Amino acid sequence: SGFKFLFFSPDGTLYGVHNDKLYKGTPPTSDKDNWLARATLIGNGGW
Amino acid sequence: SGFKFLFFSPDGTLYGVHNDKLYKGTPPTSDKDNWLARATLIGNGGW
Amino acid sequence: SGFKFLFFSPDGTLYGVHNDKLYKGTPPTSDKDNWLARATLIGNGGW
Amino acid sequence: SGFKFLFFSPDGTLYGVHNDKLYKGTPPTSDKDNWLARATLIGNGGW
Amino acid sequence: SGFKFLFFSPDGTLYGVHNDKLYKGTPPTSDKDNWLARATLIGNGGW
Ligand SMILES: CC(=O)N[C@@H]1[C@@H](O)[C@H](O)[C@@H](CO)O[C@@H]1O
Ligand SMILES: CC(=O)N[C@@H]1[C@@H](O)[C@H](O)[C@@H](CO)O[C@@H]1O
Ligand SMILES: CC(=O)N[C@@H]1[C@@H](O)[C@H](O)[C@@H](CO)O[C@@H]1O
Ligand SMILES: CC(=O)N[C@@H]1[C@@H](O)[C@H](O)[C@@H](CO)O[C@@H]1O
Ligand SMILES: CC(=O)N[C@@H]1[C@@H](O)[C@H](O)[C@@H](CO)O[C@@H]1O
């Protein structure tokens, strides 16, 4: 399923909508980085 | 049904299309922030 | 119908694909702004 | 006849995926500009 | 199915989601460029 939206802010922060929730964080630089687990949850639903 | 589009302008304003309407505003400050309730309505339909 | 694509250029111009046509213009600032009626048509189809 | 992706690079170049091919070029400035006929094909398949 | 997302970071790095994996790299230079073969894998699943 994965993300519904996945996009950058002009400040370089990666944003994503995943299971109707909004997340942000620095983009991963390696495939061992569990991005979703460490991303900042900034929206609990509705996205 | 969530958003149809969700994207940034170059100055870091978040834009979104929700129920055919267009909204803009600073991005959510936390998961406590009801963005859609405070976003500026900039289009009533047709998006 | 609504837009198929709706996105910004780095100079802050809003671009949209609507009914296979490509449009650009300054983003709307209020819900009184009929954006599609004033946007510059820059592609008459195929988008 | 219908793009899959259509988006800007931060350097102002328009990118588009059309039928599994990737194209780039300066954005069109009028509806007389046949963009896809003059765009640089930078990817042939897999997009 | 090709890519699910395909988008730029603000410094001009191309990001893409392909078969649930996240890749980044300089954008394709020409159709001689096998982008997916040389892109950096930065996320293995979940995208
Ligand atoms: C699209 C939108 O604004 N969603 C928000 C959600 O992110 C936030 O967690 C909640 C707090 O009450 O309010 C809204 O539902
Ligand atoms: C896509 C578009 O330009 N929609 C606008 C809408 O946002 C605005 O509220 C209305 C004002 O009359 O005109 C148009 O319908
Ligand atoms: C996808 C694309 O390049 N479409 C263009 C269209 O925008 C333009 O109005 C027309 C002019 O002849 O040529 C092409 O159809
Ligand atoms: C998604 C991707 O990297 N596609 C490329 C394609 O654009 C390029 O023309 C071809 C060259 O052999 O290699 C790959 O298929
Ligand atoms: C959406 C997300 O954060 N996916 C990551 C994936 O990129 C990474 O390869 C994996 C490491 O085990 O962790 C998570 O699955």
From TrEMBL, chains A, B, C, D, E:
InterPro entries reported for this sequence: Tachylectin2, Tachylectin2_sf
Listed SUPFAM superfamilies: Tachylectin-2 (SSF50934)
Binding site for N-acetyl-alpha-D-glucosamine: D31, W35, L36, N44, G45, W47
Residues annotated to bind N-acetyl-D-glucosamine: D31, N34, W35, L36, N44, G45, W47
Domain Tachylectin: 1-47
Listed name of the protein: Beta propeller
